[PDB]
Structures are given as C-alpha cells and as structure tokens.
Amino acid sequence: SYCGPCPKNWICYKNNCYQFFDEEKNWYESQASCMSQNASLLKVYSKEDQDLLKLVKSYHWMGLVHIPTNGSWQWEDGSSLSPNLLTIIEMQKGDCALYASSFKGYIENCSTPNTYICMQR
Amino acid sequence: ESYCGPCPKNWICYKNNCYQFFDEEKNWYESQASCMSQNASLLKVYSKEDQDLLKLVKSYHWMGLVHIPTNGSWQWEDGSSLSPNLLTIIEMQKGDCALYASSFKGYIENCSTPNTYICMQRTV
Ligand SMILES: CN(C)C(=O)[C@@H](NC(=O)c1ccccc1-c1ccc(C(F)(F)F)cc1)c1cccc(C(F)(F)F)c1
C-alpha cells in the first residue's frame, strides 16, 4: 500500500507526513515555517498511529500551547490534549513545549530557539 | 505533493524507499535473516541525495555491506558493488561486516558481534 500524499522530501508513516528542521527558531518562527509549507507543528493524537515518535532523538518544538488564564494546554488548531498521550514535565517557565521520546513534553520558553518538527495530514 | 510506496503499513517511507529500525541486538547473519523474513534486506546505501534521511541516523547499525578478504573489496549482500562517493569505510574492529554511522560512514565490525540493525526495501 502507498503512504501519503506528502511533500516530496517528507517522511510518511501511517498516512501522516513528518519533516525535521535543523535550523533553530523560536516557537512563533517555527509555527510560521510549517504554515508556509501548508502544515502545522507536530500534533500528538495517537500513540498507536504515531508510534514512530518513539524513535525520535533530541528535542523539538511541537504544536502545544499553554493558556495561562486557563489551566489549559491545547494544540495550534484549538483542539485539546487527550489523555495518556504525553507526559508533561516542568523544565522552564513558559507557554510552549518540546517533544522528546518517548511521548514526553518539556515546558519551554517560547522565545528560546530550538529545532522543530512539522506534520501534515 | 505525491505518494510514497509501496511499503508495509508499519514501515517508514522516504522517497519511495521503505525503512524499519530494530533495537533488538543481533549478529549480522541473524539481522539479515530478520530483514529477509519481511521481504527486505539490510540497509543498502546507493544514493546520498535520495537517502539523505540517513544523515539523521545516530549510533551504529548493521547494513548489508560485506568484505571479501580474498580480494579486499566491499560489496552489498546481493553481490552488487559499492558505488564510489557514497561511504567512507573506517577501521574499528577486525571484521568482515560493516555498521552504518552518520554521516555516510561504514565502520568495520566483527560479523558475530550483536548490534542493532536497519532493514530497507527498494521499490525500484
Ligand atoms: C536510530 N534512529 C531511529 C535515529 O537516529 C532517529 N534519529 C532522529 O530522530 C533524529 C536525530 C537527529 C535529529 C533529528 C532526528 C529526527 C527528528 C524528527 C524526525 C521526524 F520527522 F520523523 F519526526 C526524524 C528524525 C531517526 C532517524 C530516521 C528516521 C526516524 C523516524 F522518526 F522517522 F522514524 C528516526
């Protein structure tokens, strides 16, 4: 069976498209980058459908944003984080999060430059 | 925007090649057998441009490159020759097998030492 469709130089896995970007940018720059490729930052919605994320090395911006006037974490598209997907770990005071294996999110200052993962589907 | 495949459903697809990582440690022969059982072979490096994803592969993993001591040449398990300009082969341990390491390096290793490995299917 075929996987996709996905941009030419992207990784395809269970019909989701992923791309790693090694240029370090703040969270806002990274979101803008994925958007310019008609994608978004990594969104984690299923350990089963996205089990390749166990294989990811290093730490990378994903699309999770913290709403301080709530107790809320949400994805870019406004959807909620569902249960048993990410272990959220304090690291720095901030409103953004870095993905790390295995299915961890480290709270990070949105202004700090990091590598990032875009995702499309 | 195109499709990638054909591949098995739980394999990674990149530029119409299928990849799978296995973190169980096996000697070279058992690693090759495991790839073959899934209609695949150990990693073969044929193109820096079309396999540039290999720049992101960390640590050391079996690939399908073997040594013919009687002639000193390196070749892939299927008998095909190693293209120039692709891999830098570096001594490590006395052996007739090679581990892939980034970036586009081959480290000589004892074929009987268990290591993690990478399987690959071409779709030609
Ligand atoms: C053995 N090993 C498994 C690695 O070295 C590992 N390296 C890094 O993840 C890796 C290493 C360094 C920098 C970035 C990454 C990386 C980040 C995100 C993605 C993403 F875009 F895909 F999200 C892919 C790679 C790996 C290599 C190739 C493919 C994959 C996989 F994730 F696609 F499966 C993982």
Swiss-Prot record, chain A:
<dbReference type="GO" id="GO:0030246">
    <property type="term" value="F:carbohydrate binding"/>
</dbReference>
<dbReference type="GO" id="GO:0042267">
    <property type="term" value="P:natural killer cell mediated cytotoxicity"/>
</dbReference>
<dbReference type="GO" id="GO:0005886">
    <property type="term" value="C:plasma membrane"/>
</dbReference>
<dbReference type="GO" id="GO:0042288">
    <property type="term" value="F:MHC class I protein binding"/>
</dbReference>
<feature type="glycosylation site" description="N-linked (GlcNAc...) asparagine">
    <location>
        <position position="70"/>
    </location>
</feature>
<dbReference type="GO" id="GO:0009897">
    <property type="term" value="C:external side of plasma membrane"/>
</dbReference>
<keyword id="KW-0675">Receptor</keyword>
<dbReference type="GO" id="GO:0032729">
    <property type="term" value="P:positive regulation of type II interferon production"/>
</dbReference>
<keyword id="KW-0325">Glycoprotein</keyword>
<dbReference type="GO" id="GO:0030101">
    <property type="term" value="P:natural killer cell activation"/>
</dbReference>
<dbReference type="GO" id="GO:0002223">
    <property type="term" value="P:stimulatory C-type lectin receptor signaling pathway"/>
</dbReference>
<dbReference type="GO" id="GO:2000502">
    <property type="term" value="P:negative regulation of natural killer cell chemotaxis"/>
</dbReference>
<keyword id="KW-0812">Transmembrane</keyword>
<dbReference type="GO" id="GO:0002250">
    <property type="term" value="P:adaptive immune response"/>
</dbReference>
<feature type="domain" description="C-type lectin">
    <location>
        <begin position="5"/>
        <end position="120"/>
    </location>
</feature>
<dbReference type="GO" id="GO:0042802">
    <property type="term" value="F:identical protein binding"/>
</dbReference>
<feature type="disulfide bond">
    <location>
        <begin position="6"/>
        <end position="17"/>
    </location>
</feature>
<keyword id="KW-1015">Disulfide bond</keyword>
<dbReference type="GO" id="GO:0016020">
    <property type="term" value="C:membrane"/>
</dbReference>
<dbReference type="GO" id="GO:0034260">
    <property type="term" value="P:negative regulation of GTPase activity"/>
</dbReference>
<keyword id="KW-1064">Adaptive immunity</keyword>
<feature type="topological domain" description="Extracellular">
    <location>
        <begin position="1"/>
        <end position="121"/>
    </location>
</feature>
Swiss-Prot record, chain B:
<keyword id="KW-1015">Disulfide bond</keyword>
<keyword id="KW-0472">Membrane</keyword>
<feature type="disulfide bond">
    <location>
        <begin position="4"/>
        <end position="13"/>
    </location>
</feature>
<keyword id="KW-0399">Innate immunity</keyword>
<dbReference type="GO" id="GO:0005886">
    <property type="term" value="C:plasma membrane"/>
</dbReference>
<feature type="disulfide bond">
    <location>
        <begin position="35"/>
        <end position="119"/>
    </location>
</feature>
<keyword id="KW-1064">Adaptive immunity</keyword>
<dbReference type="GO" id="GO:0042802">
    <property type="term" value="F:identical protein binding"/>
</dbReference>
<protein>
    <recommendedName>
        <fullName>NKG2-D type II integral membrane protein</fullName>
    </recommendedName>
</protein>
<dbReference type="GO" id="GO:0034260">
    <property type="term" value="P:negative regulation of GTPase activity"/>
</dbReference>
<dbReference type="GO" id="GO:0030154">
    <property type="term" value="P:cell differentiation"/>
</dbReference>
<feature type="glycosylation site" description="N-linked (GlcNAc...) asparagine">
    <location>
        <position position="110"/>
    </location>
</feature>
<dbReference type="GO" id="GO:0030101">
    <property type="term" value="P:natural killer cell activation"/>
</dbReference>
<keyword id="KW-1003">Cell membrane</keyword>
<dbReference type="GO" id="GO:0009897">
    <property type="term" value="C:external side of plasma membrane"/>
</dbReference>
<keyword id="KW-0812">Transmembrane</keyword>
<dbReference type="GO" id="GO:0038023">
    <property type="term" value="F:signaling receptor activity"/>
</dbReference>
<dbReference type="GO" id="GO:0045429">
    <property type="term" value="P:positive regulation of nitric oxide biosynthetic process"/>
</dbReference>
<dbReference type="GO" id="GO:0031295">
    <property type="term" value="P:T cell costimulation"/>
</dbReference>
<feature type="disulfide bond">
    <location>
        <begin position="7"/>
        <end position="18"/>
    </location>
</feature>
<dbReference type="GO" id="GO:0002223">
    <property type="term" value="P:stimulatory C-type lectin receptor signaling pathway"/>
</dbReference>
<dbReference type="GO" id="GO:0009986">
    <property type="term" value="C:cell surface"/>
</dbReference>
